[PDB]
Design a protein around this ligand. Sequence first.
Ligand SMILES: *[C@@H]1O[C@H](CO[C@@H]2O[C@@H](C)[C@@H](O)[C@@H](O)[C@@H]2O)[C@@H](O[C@@H]2O[C@H](CO)[C@@H](O[C@@H]3O[C@H](CO)[C@@H](O)[C@H](O)[C@@H]3O)[C@H](O)[C@H]2NC(C)=O)[C@H](O)[C@H]1NC(C)=O
Ligand SMILES: *[C@@H]1O[C@H](CO[C@@H]2O[C@@H](C)[C@@H](O)[C@@H](O)[C@@H]2O)[C@@H](O[C@@H]2O[C@H](CO)[C@@H](O[C@@H]3O[C@H](CO)[C@@H](O)[C@H](O)[C@@H]3O)[C@H](O)[C@H]2NC(C)=O)[C@H](O)[C@H]1NC(C)=O
Ligand SMILES: *[C@@H]1O[C@H](CO)[C@@H](O[C@@H]2O[C@H](CO)[C@@H](O[C@@H]3O[C@H](CO)[C@@H](O)[C@H](O)[C@H]3NC(C)=O)[C@H](O)[C@H]2NC(C)=O)[C@H](O)[C@H]1NC(C)=O
Ligand SMILES: *[C@@H]1O[C@H](CO)[C@@H](O[C@@H]2O[C@H](CO)[C@@H](O[C@@H]3O[C@H](CO)[C@@H](O)[C@H](O)[C@H]3NC(C)=O)[C@H](O)[C@H]2NC(C)=O)[C@H](O)[C@H]1NC(C)=O
Ligand SMILES: *[C@@H]1O[C@H](CO)[C@@H](O[C@@H]2O[C@H](CO)[C@@H](O)[C@H](O)[C@H]2NC(C)=O)[C@H](O)[C@H]1NC(C)=O
Ligand SMILES: *[C@@H]1O[C@H](CO)[C@@H](O[C@@H]2O[C@H](CO)[C@@H](O)[C@H](O)[C@H]2NC(C)=O)[C@H](O)[C@H]1NC(C)=O
Ligand SMILES: *[C@@H]1O[C@H](CO)[C@@H](O[C@@H]2O[C@H](CO)[C@@H](O)[C@H](O)[C@H]2NC(C)=O)[C@H](O)[C@H]1NC(C)=O
Ligand SMILES: *[C@@H]1O[C@H](CO)[C@@H](O[C@@H]2O[C@H](CO)[C@@H](O)[C@H](O)[C@H]2NC(C)=O)[C@H](O)[C@H]1NC(C)=O
Ligand SMILES: *[C@@H]1O[C@H](CO)[C@@H](O[C@@H]2O[C@H](CO)[C@@H](O)[C@H](O)[C@H]2NC(C)=O)[C@H](O)[C@H]1NC(C)=O
Ligand SMILES: *[C@@H]1O[C@H](CO)[C@@H](O)[C@H](O)[C@H]1NC(C)=O
Ligand SMILES: *[C@@H]1O[C@H](CO)[C@@H](O)[C@H](O)[C@H]1NC(C)=O
Ligand SMILES: [Ca+2]
Ligand SMILES: [Ca+2]
Ligand SMILES: [Ca+2]
Ligand SMILES: [Ca+2]
Ligand SMILES: [Ca+2]
Ligand SMILES: [Zn+2]
Ligand SMILES: [Zn+2]
Lengths: 242, 535, 529, 282
Amino acid sequence: NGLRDPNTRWTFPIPYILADNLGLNAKGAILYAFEMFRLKSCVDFKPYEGESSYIIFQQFDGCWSEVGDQHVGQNISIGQGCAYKAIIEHEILHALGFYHEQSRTDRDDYVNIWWDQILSGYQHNFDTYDDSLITDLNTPYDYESLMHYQPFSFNKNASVPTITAKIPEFNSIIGQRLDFSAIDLERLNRMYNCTTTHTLLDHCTFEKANICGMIQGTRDDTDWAHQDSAQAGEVDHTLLGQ
Amino acid sequence: NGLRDPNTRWTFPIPYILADNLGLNAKGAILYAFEMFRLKSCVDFKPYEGESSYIIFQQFDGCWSEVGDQHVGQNISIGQGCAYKAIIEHEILHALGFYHEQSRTDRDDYVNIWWDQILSGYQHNFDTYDDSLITDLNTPYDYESLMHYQPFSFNKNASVPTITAKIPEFNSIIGQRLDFSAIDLERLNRMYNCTTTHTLLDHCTFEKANICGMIQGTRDDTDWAHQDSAQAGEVDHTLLGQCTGAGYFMQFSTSSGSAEEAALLESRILYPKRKQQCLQFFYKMTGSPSDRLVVWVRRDDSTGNVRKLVKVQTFQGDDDHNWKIAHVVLKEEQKFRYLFQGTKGDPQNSTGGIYLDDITLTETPCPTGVWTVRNFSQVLENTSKGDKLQSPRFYNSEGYGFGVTLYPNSRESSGYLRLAFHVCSGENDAILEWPVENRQVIITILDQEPDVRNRMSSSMVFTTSKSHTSPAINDTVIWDRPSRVGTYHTDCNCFRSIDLGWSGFISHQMLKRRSFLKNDDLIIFVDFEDITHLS
Amino acid sequence: NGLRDPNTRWTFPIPYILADNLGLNAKGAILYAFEMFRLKSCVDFKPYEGESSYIIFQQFDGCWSEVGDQHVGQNISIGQGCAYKAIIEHEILHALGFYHEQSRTDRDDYVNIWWDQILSGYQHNFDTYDDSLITDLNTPYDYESLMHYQPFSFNKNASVPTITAKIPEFNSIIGQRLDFSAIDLERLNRMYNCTTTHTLLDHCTFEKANICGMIQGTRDDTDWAHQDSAEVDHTLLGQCTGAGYFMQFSTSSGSAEEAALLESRILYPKRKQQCLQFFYKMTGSPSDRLVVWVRRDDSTGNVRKLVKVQTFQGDDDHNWKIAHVVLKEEQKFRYLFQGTKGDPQNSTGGIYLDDITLTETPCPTGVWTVRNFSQVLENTSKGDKLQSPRFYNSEGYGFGVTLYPNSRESSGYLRLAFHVCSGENDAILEWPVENRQVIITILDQEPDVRNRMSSSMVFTTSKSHTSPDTVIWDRPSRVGTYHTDCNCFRSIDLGWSGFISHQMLKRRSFLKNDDLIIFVDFEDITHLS
Amino acid sequence: LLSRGCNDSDVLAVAGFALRDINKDRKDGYVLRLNRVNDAQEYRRGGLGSLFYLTLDVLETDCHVLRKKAWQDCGMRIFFESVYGQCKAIFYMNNPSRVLYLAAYNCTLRPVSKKKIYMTCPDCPSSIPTDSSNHQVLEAATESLAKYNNENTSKQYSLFKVTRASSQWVVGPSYFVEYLIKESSVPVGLCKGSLTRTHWEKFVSVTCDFFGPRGSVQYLPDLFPVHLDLTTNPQGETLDISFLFLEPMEEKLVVLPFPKEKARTAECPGPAQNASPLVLPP
Ligand SMILES: *[C@@H]1O[C@H](CO[C@@H]2O[C@@H](C)[C@@H](O)[C@@H](O)[C@@H]2O)[C@@H](O[C@@H]2O[C@H](CO)[C@@H](O[C@@H]3O[C@H](CO)[C@@H](O)[C@H](O)[C@@H]3O)[C@H](O)[C@H]2NC(C)=O)[C@H](O)[C@H]1NC(C)=O
Ligand SMILES: *[C@@H]1O[C@H](CO[C@@H]2O[C@@H](C)[C@@H](O)[C@@H](O)[C@@H]2O)[C@@H](O[C@@H]2O[C@H](CO)[C@@H](O[C@@H]3O[C@H](CO)[C@@H](O)[C@H](O)[C@@H]3O)[C@H](O)[C@H]2NC(C)=O)[C@H](O)[C@H]1NC(C)=O
Ligand SMILES: *[C@@H]1O[C@H](CO)[C@@H](O[C@@H]2O[C@H](CO)[C@@H](O[C@@H]3O[C@H](CO)[C@@H](O)[C@H](O)[C@H]3NC(C)=O)[C@H](O)[C@H]2NC(C)=O)[C@H](O)[C@H]1NC(C)=O
Ligand SMILES: *[C@@H]1O[C@H](CO)[C@@H](O[C@@H]2O[C@H](CO)[C@@H](O[C@@H]3O[C@H](CO)[C@@H](O)[C@H](O)[C@H]3NC(C)=O)[C@H](O)[C@H]2NC(C)=O)[C@H](O)[C@H]1NC(C)=O
Ligand SMILES: *[C@@H]1O[C@H](CO)[C@@H](O[C@@H]2O[C@H](CO)[C@@H](O)[C@H](O)[C@H]2NC(C)=O)[C@H](O)[C@H]1NC(C)=O
Ligand SMILES: *[C@@H]1O[C@H](CO)[C@@H](O[C@@H]2O[C@H](CO)[C@@H](O)[C@H](O)[C@H]2NC(C)=O)[C@H](O)[C@H]1NC(C)=O
Ligand SMILES: *[C@@H]1O[C@H](CO)[C@@H](O[C@@H]2O[C@H](CO)[C@@H](O)[C@H](O)[C@H]2NC(C)=O)[C@H](O)[C@H]1NC(C)=O
Ligand SMILES: *[C@@H]1O[C@H](CO)[C@@H](O[C@@H]2O[C@H](CO)[C@@H](O)[C@H](O)[C@H]2NC(C)=O)[C@H](O)[C@H]1NC(C)=O
Ligand SMILES: *[C@@H]1O[C@H](CO)[C@@H](O[C@@H]2O[C@H](CO)[C@@H](O)[C@H](O)[C@H]2NC(C)=O)[C@H](O)[C@H]1NC(C)=O
Ligand SMILES: *[C@@H]1O[C@H](CO)[C@@H](O)[C@H](O)[C@H]1NC(C)=O
Ligand SMILES: *[C@@H]1O[C@H](CO)[C@@H](O)[C@H](O)[C@H]1NC(C)=O
Ligand SMILES: [Ca+2]
Ligand SMILES: [Ca+2]
Ligand SMILES: [Ca+2]
Ligand SMILES: [Ca+2]
Ligand SMILES: [Ca+2]
Ligand SMILES: [Zn+2]
Ligand SMILES: [Zn+2]
């Protein structure tokens, strides 16, 4: 679902303005979304200093972004309730050249669109783009994607889903608003050549015998066992003896 | 261990020259090492065409490289005996701005250097560097690093190591020369901003209910189950029942219904970068012998519509019910999807199904021959020193028949596996050129991990050569027509050449480590292809 | 019959537009007609890219073309029933600059026009032009010309011919729709300074002692004889004394596993795919093996990389058999024949090789040889039938043809009719199968393609083909009739009552060895939509 | 008839004045900005001025016509709800007499193309018809009005009509609207507002601003034909104009049939105020 043309790619840090029409709750939610980007990708943000393109975030009507870097600098809107971190993250993924997951070229292999159940005047929000416009980034269609729309989106009747997964399990999943999915990060990283997150400094689960390059001191008396999770109650926290 | 200064970086592809002082074997091995870079990283290489910086590869004294891009262009030496892919990968990692692992700033925390055991005047080869010269790329010290020196490096006494791990288990692992370590790829990717790699086009292990973006047909009859390994005696190949609630495979039952019912597992649309691919996968056919697993390719018709169908291969149920490896050569230059038609034959005579797991699609040649030994750990215990196993005869692109001899317990060294190539007589021999003069032999012990980047396979390389002779054949070339030179085997009704290859291709401890025996079985790839065109 | 004005000569490739008012069948049949031009002449065609003059092919009323290059570009009409190879070749020959053969200046010397039998308001359709407008290209009048009118053309009384040859035997021959005649190709060659074809890459009947520049291996045990028909060849069947030539590798003597390579000249493929046709016999042991190989370029300009491409074995049939091997060469190469002895003690014979032909085209998807076909015609009642073995297309659709050797519908005609067979793939294929162009071709069996005038009928499997009332091309297991004859559910058969007349089948080497060879293609043309 | 350039200094001013007259004439909808002159042609009559025939490209501004602003007093609307299109107008000019007059006009307008908006910004609130079939747009405007009545204790207001509407579904069904009101008259001001439901939290917002010739406007479905003639007569029509003059002296104007666009100059259409292919007319 990424915009193919490499000119549409930002160059980090994306300079940003927060407009003063934003509530405090929306300004703080934006900066919290930036921390998630910086924490899960090489995407970075800076305050504005006269750059040619930049995001201005706004409390305009609705919650929306142009897709990819418009080289004049661009609005994003964050209307009421879009203060939720995941909705900021979704709009910033549009700003980072990403279309909705149900707008993939291959989307019809994965999701039904119930055109008959869409509100008249809103069927075009389920358009799909050709592969000259968008890459797959060599990724599968992801139901867990933050870019996906939930089942009850643009529907005539509140009880009837506009969009459903052809693998029927995923009806209970599509359009999650938790966070980026693992494939949304995999895509974002393929799009921006990100190999290292700005804030994940280290992590370790000891699954490997080099213990994540920890060492044991010699000034101390003794050593910690690297323990195999095999004993009757003494399981690890990563796998819980699974 | 990376050279910090960003001026020392290459810009891909790295332009290169192979000097003619390289033997054909060395030229061929260098190209094979590039195919590993192109398969495990975004590193790429191009023939030289007038660039300011480039690598020239030459057979000088020993095997060495300057570190990072020297902007005037630079030598890599690959001296005699350095042809194995891991040594080339180690030198190319030096040209790609890496130092040895035991030269990290923090190395003293992870390894002991027994200075008094180092040969005099060789202490410097163990000089560490400071953090101004080098980044850790925010990665731990990796004993399994290809850059790490072997325990016996520059040592005075052949019984005594120069360098040992402070975690004593890694004494046995430091200076592995299988492949890139997982962390060496991580560091190379963090250095060169890689995320994709040029030659891994797809893979799937099914661990995710998304099934790797595979889809199920509707013009077929039924569906493959996304079968959970929880059912007794019915595990996946990725984890083989190691994880509860979490091994997955596709399963097409053939035990019930009509004959010739089918289900088309269909992959997501793929955009090949090369003219050839190898779809590898693991499968079972425990159902009827008339069951067919057929692999199909749905390809673009040039209108942007992936609807055209091409049957590429068929598999059928032998008496072996255990997880088999498959390879299918695909030849897709246009967007395509790989497909698996499961097909029921005689459900009245099926008690099982067709199964899939551990799918891997690389934009490479396939292994020319593929040999699997069942219950290897049990073979390896039961077999005496100097006993042998022989691979079934395989035919190369040119039609030369060949096989590998595996001697599970090497008589030449305890705790080593000896693995040796031979030409077999075969149906084509009467028209082929003899002796084999320039056919490179690559033997690989597959690390059975679906993601190629995770894999650290072991591989040894030689080129059949005029110099290869024995008194046992009156000092004539080993590669001459096997009827004239080889020895007869009713074991396949073949002659087989004298067998050349390595006592201690790999050690038993090294084979046990890295889960090479994933199912307790052993999978050996062989390639055998003419490299004359590199002369 | 060529337009004299040299300003009217196209410069190749002719850029073309296939207008979307053409049915899929017409689009595919026009692309098939272009292949015949590229295979028999230096004429070539390209998709349109803004050129000044070009041909736009359109489904208008009937079949017609302006004659020669109109420098602003021009129409060709291909209406209902107009979408057959020879009819398209006729209209493209008009655009290339040819008039009808009976419009020759000297036509009166060769034909009678029965003016009184022409429809009123059609008299000018039989006009003849002076030698200022036209050119004979210094060629005789050709009764066999594709540009010639059929005898019953534009007649009042359907029983009565409008046009007849003065030599009365040619009246049956005139107005042939098999394809271009030798003279038509010769006139085309002279008009466009053609010297060779684009997709005839090689051919060899061995009639010349240099064996078409073929060479024998030294990295083998033995050689093929260049055998003299003193037991005969396939090009002449022993019709001419002392000139029948064919390569023969005897397997009745020596050890088994003994072999000989025969290798072609080095050949420079202009396309990615070629078809190596040949005729062969394997009168020797069942274990003898005729293996076709390619010695291709090893990428250093040295033709040495072997690739085994196909093996042929010996059946009880020891008559000349037609082979095809798809080659996929994009770099210079030799095609090779490894003849191999298996069990010489149980060979009384050998392997044979004649009439090799290499074209830069797809191979025929299915190929059926009906033996002793004159005998079949003498044996077989009207409405009795024969059915091909079950071919499979590139997509895996199982298919075959029905032959009614004496048509029930009229005396002295074949009916050939395609049908879709059930096959091992059907459960995954789409149904009905449609947009799949069937081409049925009776092979003419000249070893030189330019000499060949194969008869070919084309149609596209379609939704409109429904038999009272589901599409005939729907899945054979549920709309086909079962056959114990191959364990196949063959479908309802569609094709042509009168594909060719017996009296035309007697001529042109359609039955060259007293046997009939039918090619079939059954290929998806949905990508032309 | 003289074809004239769209960048000509007289034609540019005349088009602005004509568009301002159209905005003043309009009893409902919004003040239109002149994106550019699109064609211009002139009938010449010696000393007593000329008759101009103009084709325009135009955009909808942020001001309703009951506010009575000129279009230079008004901002550019947001891209995701821009209304765009074309006008034909007939206009007499005589600068020596200081006489200028819009004779007649017709205009065709559209909301910006819904596909081209989606492609530019997938989450942008897509614009929709304001008629009473959309119950939920009426709920949005009446909820925002109820919030305004609850916020403003001095006076209470009632819905006259809904003038613009759009919606988005990301956080949930989210409607955005503009509408007219009167106290509890000619409509007294333009309201702007919204209604949004999540599954749990709900939001409403509101802000409100308190404030013949032959011709027409039509709002069509999205992807510009314009029917206009005061006469069919090839001689033209001797239409009275005496009432335009400060002393209403006996004066009549020969209105020729509207000059066809086949007579366009290479100086037409002109330079645009907003050249974006979303909202620049064909
Ligand atoms: C039914 O299918 C079995 C094999 O399939 C297995 O058994 C079914 C009952 C179901 O449980 C299936 O799900 C399951 O996979 C056929 O048995 C096999 O037949 C072949 C051919 O006769 C035997 O092969 C031969 O084996 C000898 C050595 O033993 C070789 O020398 C020969 O060259 C050849 O390979 C094979 O041994 C045999 N296997 C077993 C386990 O019996 C069975 O014939 C079939 N029955 C019918 C009526 O279809
Ligand atoms: C020796 O080779 C013959 C066939 O080859 C022919 O005879 C040799 C002696 C030489 O003269 C060759 O130059 C010549 O080409 C073998 O005979 C054939 O064996 C096959 C297999 O059994 C038979 O096929 C079967 O036939 C029946 C009908 O009879 C069918 O129903 C079956 O489906 C199947 O096709 C074939 O008929 C038979 N042909 C003849 C003419 O006998 C022979 O087996 C072989 N012997 C040895 C010991 O190698
Ligand atoms: C992420 O990494 C990508 C490589 O994996 C980068 O892609 C390369 O970007 C180059 C420009 O920065 C491209 O060069 C251009 O190539 C085209 C022909 O394809 C030429 O016409 C242009 O003139 C040339 N531009 C210049 C200035 O020379 C590379 O072709 C391109 N390579 C590939 C494989 O796409 C991405 O730029 C990078 N993206 C980010 C945001 O980091
Ligand atoms: C891997 O990705 C890195 C970003 O994550 C790239 O690092 C950036 O490269 C820029 C040049 O392409 C550097 O800009 C230059 O910085 C120096 C000071 O370091 C200035 O003197 C130069 O003026 C400036 N260039 C220009 C044109 O002004 C960035 O500083 C640098 N950023 C960081 C954080 O390192 C790597 O280049 C890239 N490497 C590879 C091998 O792909
Ligand atoms: C919304 O959709 C539901 C399901 O299609 C409709 O519910 C049914 O309505 C009929 C009357 O029209 C009842 O007899 C059924 O019992 C209802 N089914 C259920 C599951 O409750 C509902 O009417 C629709 N509402 C609107 C406004 O469209
Ligand atoms: C090399 O190292 C080995 C192992 O430490 C040395 O072996 C010792 O040799 C002496 C006799 O010379 C024996 O008494 C010891 O028992 C051996 N030790 C072991 C552990 O086996 C060897 O001498 C060293 N040689 C040199 C030249 O350094
Ligand atoms: C092909 O033939 C058609 C007529 O069947 C030509 O179309 C006509 O062209 C003239 C001149 O432009 C028009 O006045 C007619 O209205 C057209 N008629 C139709 C039915 O379209 C067409 O121009 C010809 N094209 C060429 C290249 O010869
Ligand atoms: C078409 O030509 C045939 C042959 O010349 C005509 O057939 C003859 O018709 C007359 C009656 O009009 C019969 O008495 C003759 O016996 C027929 N002769 C033959 C050979 O059958 C036929 O009349 C013509 N028909 C038309 C419509 O012109
Ligand atoms: C964000 O969108 C607003 C429109 O809502 C743009 O602001 C308009 O800009 C033009 C040109 O200066 C003015 O004519 C309008 O009066 C402005 N309207 C408002 C409400 O301010 C703004 O320029 C856009 N900004 C970016 C960075 O895209
Ligand atoms: C492998 O070992 C098992 C016992 O654990 C035995 O049942 C099986 O037959 C063996 N398979 C082979 C091929 O030796
Ligand atoms: C063909 O005719 C010959 C006689 O000339 C006869 O011997 C042979 O059996 C016939 N073969 C077939 C296949 O009809
Ligand atoms: Ca300690
Ligand atoms: Ca299915
Ligand atoms: Ca698995
Ligand atoms: Ca011959
Ligand atoms: Ca020879
Ligand atoms: Zn004609
Ligand atoms: Zn969105």
